[PDB]
Structures are given as structure tokens and as C-alpha cells.
Amino acid sequence: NQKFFTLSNGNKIPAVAVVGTGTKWAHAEETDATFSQELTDIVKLSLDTVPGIVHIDAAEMYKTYPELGAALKETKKPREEIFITDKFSSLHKISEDPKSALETALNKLGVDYVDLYLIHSPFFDKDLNIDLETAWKQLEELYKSGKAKNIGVSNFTVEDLKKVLAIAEIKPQVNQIEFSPFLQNQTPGIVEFSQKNDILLEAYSPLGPLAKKPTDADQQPFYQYLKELSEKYNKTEAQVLLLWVYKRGILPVTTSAKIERIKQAQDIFSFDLTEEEVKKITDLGLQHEPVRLWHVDFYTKYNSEAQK
């Protein structure tokens, strides 16, 4: 049975996002230009077949609205069984401001609102004629007008959150960060700070440790224990890790090309980790050095604090 997080505003969000539109298969030189049928297909198949409320992770920056649009139009999934996260591209300017970006997203997506709208990065493009304060106020209006049912940020440091909390009429509900066993603090003290201020974390690329397991794999305690738990529960290693993210009070955001893994992702609440299994994953993960796949140029300097 599906599990949800309760945001600070009372709204429910599916506790795993199993469908992402960040990753494309397009057979061309300029992949930025080419529609990916194989992406609309995997998304539409997800929507059609994945049980319960299906949480999609989109962003302006992915430039895959048409693909997601095509699948949304063609799906027999009704709109209220889809949870659509979308992200204003603040790092690489595509639209002037959040309101223009969301307007353009709704047009292309064929929907009237998104269920969550995030400011994608605190490092505002120098070409944007808006700063974070103004950016947030726009999201506050989109929220009020119901075009964004929930609002938050992504890749924000404690500092970035304070700037926003300092001017916030509507408290940001979500901070989407890179989080996994091998990067347990994207930026110094973010997890503890976010959870103490009732800001829900999502974890992007939580499956990093399983991206390409090391050569000396089942010598490494992290990988031995993870394997151990996969057999105990008769689940995939991925499912264990996704569930661990959840058990940490964080909403894991994952994607696959393979409908099996997506369905497995949705089905992580077919099982449960004990307190000590979670602590041990946490612990054995923390012995690993930081593995950061995202906002690398900005946050590499924070690596010394990521695996505390």
C-alpha cells in the first residue's frame, strides 16, 4: 500500500518518485533537439501500469516537456493519480521567471497545474533579471493561484533556505537535494536543518552507490550488508536503498528505462527495514567517501562535510 509524506501545508506527496524525465534516449548528434519517443513510451507505460499515485519528476531544464506532454495526453491514467513535480530552471535561464516558465510548462504538458514546483538551483543564472527573493514570491503566487499545489526549492544550502524563510509568506515545503548513502549531506548540515524546519527532503540519485558497483564489491561491508538485506526481504538492492531513503524521512527520486525497476521502485512499501538496519546502512554508507554526481562545480568544496 502506497505511502505519502505530509508536507508542512497538510498536502500529501507520494513517498517515492519512480518516473523521471531527466534521462533521454535520442539517436542524434544534437540530442537537445530531438524528441525521445522511447521516453514518452516509458513514461506512458509507467502511468498506465504502475499502481497507485505515480509521482513524476520533471524540470524545465530537462527540455523534455513535449515527451511528458505526449505521455500525459495519451495515458489513461487520470490526472489525480499523477503527481507532477516540475522545476524552474534558475541555473540555466530558459524562461524569464517562474511564472513564465510554469505557464510554458502547463501549455506543453497539457495540464492546469503541477503538484509541486521547485526552484531548481540557488545559483541564479547571471542572465536572469530576477533574484531568489523575487523568484520565491512568484512561486508563492503560483501556489496561491493553485497552478502549483506545492512549492519548494532544490539544491539549497542552509543559507539559501534562510534567505527564503526570511522573506517567505509560504514556507518552502520541499528541498530536493542529492542524497544517498555516499552523500548524506549535500551541503553542510542540510538534512538535519531541513527536517528540523519541517522542510521535506527529496533525494535525487539515491541509487548512486549502485550506479557502477566497485570491482571489489562483496568485499566492501556496505555492499555485503545491502546484499544481505536484499536476500532477507527478497528484494532488489535498489529497493533496499530506496526504502532506506524513505526510512530516513526523505523522499527518494529515482528513474529507470526499465518498467520493472520503476514498478519495483513504487513497490518499496511492500516491505520495511528495522531501526538497526537503517542505522547500519547509514553508518556503512558514511564510511564511504562522498560520491557527488550533481551541482559538482558548486558543491565539491562541501565534500568534506557531506559524509559526516
Side-chain angles (χ1 to χ4, degrees), residues 49-51 239 258-267:
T49 58
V50 179
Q239 275 178 304
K258 330 169 179 295
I259 182 59
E260 255 285 8
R261 300 227 188 131
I262 294 173
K263 285 186 143 256
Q264 279 160 347
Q266 186 85 342
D267 196 45

Side-chain angles (χ1 to χ4, degrees), residues 35-52:
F35 188 101
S36 179
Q37 188 59 56
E38 270 127 334
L39 173 61
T40 88
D41 284 5
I42 184 52
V43 168
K44 172 169 154 276
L45 177 59
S46 291
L47 286 186
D48 277 350
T49 58
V50 179

Side-chain angles (χ1 to χ4, degrees), residues 212-225:
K212 190 189 189 297
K213 289 191 290 200
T215 47
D216 284 351
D218 269 335
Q219 269 182 286
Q220 259 201 64
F222 175 76
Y223 287 112
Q224 293 166 347
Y225 184 51

Side-chain angles (χ1 to χ4, degrees), residues 67-112:
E67 284 97 331
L68 182 50
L72 280 168
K73 158 175 170 168
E74 290 167 21
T75 196
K76 284 217 147 87
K77 193 66 144 168
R79 170 72 183 82
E80 49 273 5
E81 288 180 20
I82 312 169
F83 193 105
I84 303 176
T85 306
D86 181 37
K87 302 186 199 47
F88 166 62
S89 194
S90 55
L91 183 68
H92 298 306
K93 160 175 185 164
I94 303 176
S95 185
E96 276 297 309
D97 58 2
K99 106 185 166 213
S100 300
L102 181 60
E103 219 42 50
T104 295
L106 299 175
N107 292 142
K108 285 169 169 190
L109 286 182
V111 298
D112 315 339

Side-chain angles (χ1 to χ4, degrees), residues 52-201:
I53 304 202
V54 161
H55 179 171
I56 301 167
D57 196 71
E60 194 184 19
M61 197 186 243
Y62 298 163
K63 298 199 144 161
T64 45
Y65 283 148
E67 284 97 331
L68 182 50
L72 280 168
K73 158 175 170 168
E74 290 167 21
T75 196
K76 284 217 147 87
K77 193 66 144 168
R79 170 72 183 82
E80 49 273 5
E81 288 180 20
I82 312 169
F83 193 105
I84 303 176
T85 306
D86 181 37
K87 302 186 199 47
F88 166 62
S89 194
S90 55
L91 183 68
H92 298 306
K93 160 175 185 164
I94 303 176
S95 185
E96 276 297 309
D97 58 2
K99 106 185 166 213
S100 300
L102 181 60
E103 219 42 50
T104 295
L106 299 175
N107 292 142
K108 285 169 169 190
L109 286 182
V111 298
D112 315 339
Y113 63 99
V114 299
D115 296 87
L116 176 65
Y117 202 47
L118 307 186
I119 294 168
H120 199 168
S121 179
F123 299 94
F124 273 43
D125 196 322
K126 65 195 165 60
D127 281 345
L128 275 181
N129 302 131
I130 195 182
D131 59 19
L132 170 52
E133 172 182 23
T134 312
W136 185 253
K137 278 164 189 301
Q138 289 214 347
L139 266 78
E140 274 175 356
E141 297 294 308
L142 297 176
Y143 176 84
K144 273 185 275 211
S145 72
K147 297 187 164 197
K149 194 173 174 171
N150 301 287
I151 58 172
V153 301
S154 183
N155 302 302
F156 274 42
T157 64
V158 162
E159 172 169 63
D160 304 315
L161 281 171
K162 278 164 162 155
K163 284 167 198 211
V164 158
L165 280 165
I167 62 95
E169 179 187 302
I170 316 296
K171 186 175 181 180
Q173 285 125 25
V174 170
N175 184 13
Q176 185 183 103
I177 60 158
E178 192 171 355
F179 172 100
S180 82
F182 291 176
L183 196 85
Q184 284 190 42
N185 269 293
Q186 176 184 50
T187 63
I190 192 51
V191 164
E192 304 57 48
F193 177 93
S194 289
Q195 300 198 315
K196 261 202 273 296
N197 285 258
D198 193 22
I199 295 161
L200 181 74
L201 298 160

Side-chain angles (χ1 to χ4, degrees), residues 225-278:
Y225 184 51
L226 185 62
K227 176 171 212 147
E228 202 176 297
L229 293 177
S230 98
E231 287 161 351
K232 175 183 168 197
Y233 285 102
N234 200 58
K235 300 286 169 196
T236 65
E237 289 178 347
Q239 275 178 304
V240 167
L241 283 194
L242 292 176
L243 190 57
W244 169 84
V245 168
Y246 172 75
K247 300 295 303 193
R248 288 298 301 289
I250 302 169
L251 189 176
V253 173
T254 195
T255 199
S256 193
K258 330 169 179 295
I259 182 59
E260 255 285 8
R261 300 227 188 131
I262 294 173
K263 285 186 143 256
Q264 279 160 347
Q266 186 85 342
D267 196 45
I268 55 169
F269 311 116
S270 57
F271 81 111
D272 194 26
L273 299 178
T274 71
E275 226 152 353
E276 261 191 358
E277 291 171 344
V278 168

